[PDB]
Design a protein around this ligand. Structure first.
Ligand code: C5P
Lengths: 147, 158
RNA sequence: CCCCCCC
């Protein structure tokens, strides 16, 4: 059972991270969702979500190694994903502002595909700007182009 | 914080051992104590697959092991994780950028800004270009955008 | 325009 496996695995790490952490794992469409509550959560998240991503990444890998490909897993704490999407929706809305004036394209910072997706999605059918990614790997980033 | 040898060694052995079992049963683990720091190497199994895309996996294991060591003992013991000469090949890539910067800067007489870099990586740049007869180094900026600038020992007149 | 490779 993928849920029970994640519970034992993520429960193992959570104990070493903070005894106040508690875990809920649920499926929501195609996506396995792991929510952490309790204790100093910012310490769990870490600077720029660095700790939460390391857990999420490793959780994904041990999940793939036992059950195979096709799973989507997202790990979250105290609505940190929302805030990160909102901040991403901002700055992108800011990009369409700058590119609107200056007819010169604008290069956004590198982002993983899930975050580039959000940029593409917000600026969908924007009257002034389009989006298209560039570069490869950790280099890859969205470019805001003018019409 | 407690002595590196003893519990911190055994703690990391058991923690990484459990993680490596799920990643690949072929993995074995050597954990070395260097003074009051810890060093850990993963051997066996598919090491390419352990490292993962652009090293994301080895790095997430390193980061997380550091964090849980700090939670357990109060320090990360400057833990450094390696596999299949990963750390060495990345030390070389950083050295390459600094080399190409040295050449360009000594020619143009203009400073060049290297890509932003963690302090660990910034040290490698500084050390490689110490006592370099044509260029020098000095960092600039704050936070994630702190990066080494390579300066010509003798500036362009202009 | 997921993300881990079984890339
Ligand atoms: N000339 C230099 C400059 C920095 N360093 C090292 O590089 C690290 C990064 O410092 P910067 O902020 O100067 O890049 C320092 O913490 C120090 O260990 C060095 O070893 N020699």
């Amino acid at each position: 059972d993928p849920r029970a496996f994640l519970e034992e695995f993520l429960g193992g790490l959570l104990l070493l991270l903070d005894p106040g952490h508690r875990l809920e794992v649920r499926v929501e469409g195609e996506t396995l969702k792991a929510e952490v509550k309790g204790g100093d959560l910012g310490r769990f998240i870490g600077k720029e979500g660095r700790t939460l991503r390391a857990v999420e990444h490793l959780a994904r890998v041990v999940l793939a190694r036992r059950f195979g490909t096709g799973y989507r897993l997202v790990l979250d704490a105290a609505g940190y994903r929302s805030r990160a999407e909102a901040r991403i929706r901002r700055l992108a809305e800011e990009a369409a502002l700058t590119v609107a004036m200056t007819g010169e394209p604008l290069h956004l910072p590198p982002m993983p595909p899930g975050e580039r997706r959000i940029v593409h999605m917000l600026l969908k059918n924007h009257p002034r700007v389009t989006t298209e990614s560039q570069g490869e790997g950790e280099e890859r980033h969205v470019v805001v182009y003018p019409r």
